[PDB]
């Protein structure tokens, strides 16, 4: 997981979710596209 | 082994046993285990022209189990029955003739050989000639350690007397006197010295076409996938002016056993992203056989077709100037991979492309980042000189690699 101050979609299966007051990006295709914070 | 049978070193065994046409008897060994199905071996080996003696038949299939012991008597029956179909003529009265299995030196008794007698008889006293060496059998030991006076036609004995330790492939022959023995020995080393220079020039890929003849090749790739790709590509080539057929082919470095295979089969060595060992290098030097390392897949086949039509020679492409053995690594957290090394061949200089190879298989391909000694940035290190090196945008350079540096000849 990559922690950055600015997270956003990197492909066309990335989804933006707000989970316990934290914006996360989850990818159903490539696990390398997981992000936290931002 | 009954569990997990047929692996890329069994195929090497089948190739080695096919180069010299010999009967093969298959003995599936580890049947005393839960997951020990032999039929997947039976048909997995069947796609190697080793089809069993139940569907077609050129080889039996007998299951033994060494540790437990079962099945052996069937294996002995099978091997003897296979032998019965083949030849086996010998006269236990002629002068002895055989081969030597292994030799060793010893402070007591001097040199010792393990001759296997093949025809005739070797009663104690004869004038033996073995390759270059000659002498008299002053003593003989049998397999179990007891002295014997006579040797059968196929019974391994161990003699004493030769003036030097013989090799592991020479012929033991009984002769009349020592003078004839000396004459034959001198002639033998003359001929043996003469063969090498002819082989080291007529055996090149450059001169296969000049003087069918079924061009033979031995291939050692780096990853299997490239190996089957290249074997498939080379499958269809050669129609009426020479033909190509691989006689080897495995994954790993160019082991000395593979060089021996090529030497015995008069083949030529192709190495794909691999390097030859010390023993392979020494055998290559002795026998003068050709050996070429290639970087890309298609250059191999383009050379094969060019030499099949025999239109060009030359070397070019790449020449290696300098190999450094990495000694220890002290990679500093300031984004570095500074690896110490000591140069073992040639000279290493900055503005060249490098090649990182571990266990004789190349892992990286790129230029340098730093080649200082302490802080000098010499940009040129003579052989025998310790230094530190750094590869650009690469890490995981372990302890025990080599750093080849080469010029792409234009």
């Amino acid at each position: 997981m990559k922690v950055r101050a600015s997270v956003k979609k990197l492909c066309r299966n990335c989804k933006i979710i707000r989970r316990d007051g934290i914006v996360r990006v989850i990818c159903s295709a490539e696990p390398r596209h997981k992000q936290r914070q931002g | 082994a009954a569990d997990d049978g047929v692996m890329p070193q069994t195929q090497e065994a089948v190739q080695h046993a096919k180069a010299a046409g010999v009967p093969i008897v298959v003995a599936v060994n580890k049947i005393d285990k839960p997951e020990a199905n032999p039929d997947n071996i039976k048909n997995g080996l069947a796609a190697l022209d080793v089809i069993p003696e139940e569907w077609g038949g050129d080889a039996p299939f007998v299951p033994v189990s060494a540790k437990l012991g079962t099945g052996v008597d069937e294996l002995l029956e099978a091997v003897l029955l296979q032998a019965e179909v083949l030849e086996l003529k010998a006269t236990p009265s002629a002068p002895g003739r055989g081969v030597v299995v292994e030799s060793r030196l010893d402070k007591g008794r001097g040199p010792v050989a393990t001759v296997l007698v093949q025809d005739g008889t070797l009663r104690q006293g004869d004038m033996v000639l073995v390759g270059i060496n000659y002498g008299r059998v002053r003593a003989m030991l049998d397999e179990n350690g007891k002295p014997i006076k006579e040797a059968g036609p196929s019974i391994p004995v161990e003699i004493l007397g030769l003036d030097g330790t013989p090799d592991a492939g020479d012929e033991m022959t009984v002769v009349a006197d020592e003078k004839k023995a000396r004459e034959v020995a001198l002639f033998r080393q003359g001929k043996f010295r003469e063969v090498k220079l002819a082989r080291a020039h007529a055996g090149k890929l450059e001169n296969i076409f000049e003087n069918k003849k079924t061009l033979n090749i031995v291939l050692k790739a780096d990853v299997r996938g490239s190996l089957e790709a290249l074997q498939g590509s080379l499958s269809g080539l050669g129609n009426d002016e020479v033909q190509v057929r691989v006689v080897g082919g495995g994954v790993g470095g160019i082991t000395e056993s593979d060089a021996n295979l090529a030497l015995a089969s008069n083949a030529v060595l192709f190495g794909f992203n691999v390097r030859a060992d010390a023993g392979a290098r020494k055998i290559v030097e002795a026998e003068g056989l050709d050996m070429r390392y290639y970087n890309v897949i298609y250059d191999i086949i383009e050379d094969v077709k060019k030499a099949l039509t025999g239109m060009l020679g030359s070397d070019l492409r790449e020449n290696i100037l300098g190999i450094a053995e990495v000694r220890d690594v002290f990679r500093s957290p300031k984004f570095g991979a500074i690896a110490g090394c000591m140069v073992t061949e040639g000279m290493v200089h900055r503005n060249r492309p490098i090649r990182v190879l571990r266990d004789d298989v190349v892992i990286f391909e790129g230029e340098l980042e730093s080649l200082r000694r302490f802080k000098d940035d010499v940009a040129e290190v003579r052989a025998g000189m310790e230094c530190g090196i750094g590869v650009k945008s690469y890490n995981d350079v372990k302890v025990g690699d080599k750093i080849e540096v080469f010029e792409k000849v234009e």
């Binding site: - | 498939g232 499958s235 269809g236 080539l237």
Partner: protein, 134 residues
């Protein structure tokens, strides 16, 4: 398989490759069909050959037609094509020949009539470099 043979070339097995891509079939029967090509204009004209081996192994020869790229090349002079079409136009093309190849290209071309086939070939011509003219 949808490869192309050239008015009899089955003598070699360089392009056979019937092991990685196609089933192993006795190439001699296809070599026995090398005479079934019978050329027509030299042993260099390629032909569309499709082998039916999907069901069982009875190799069948389709021999649909000839490409309308060699024809527009061969039957209009220059044996090449402009590496920069419409920028290095090799040379204009006579109309009725485009119909003539369209007339011979009765198989396929999926058109209501040759009046639409003429317009079909010119698209192929527009890439070769031939200047289409009526």
């Amino acid at each position: 398989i949808k490869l192309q043979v050239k008015a009899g070339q089955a003598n070699p097995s360089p392009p056979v490759g019937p092991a990685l891509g196609q089933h192993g079939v006795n190439i001699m029967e296809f070599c026995k069909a090398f005479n079934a090509k019978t050329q027509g204009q030299e042993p260099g004209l390629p032909t569309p050959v499709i082998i039916t081996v999907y069901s069982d192994r009875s190799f069948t020869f389709e021999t649909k037609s000839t490409p309308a790229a060699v024809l527009l090349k061969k039957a209009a002079g220059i044996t090449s094509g402009s590496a920069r079409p419409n920028s290095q136009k090799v040379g204009t093309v006579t109309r009725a020949q485009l119909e003539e190849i369209a007339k011979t290209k009765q198989a396929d071309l999926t058109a209501a009539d040759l009046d639409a086939a003429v317009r079909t070939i010119a698209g192929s011509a527009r890439s070769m470099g031939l200047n289409v003219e009526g």
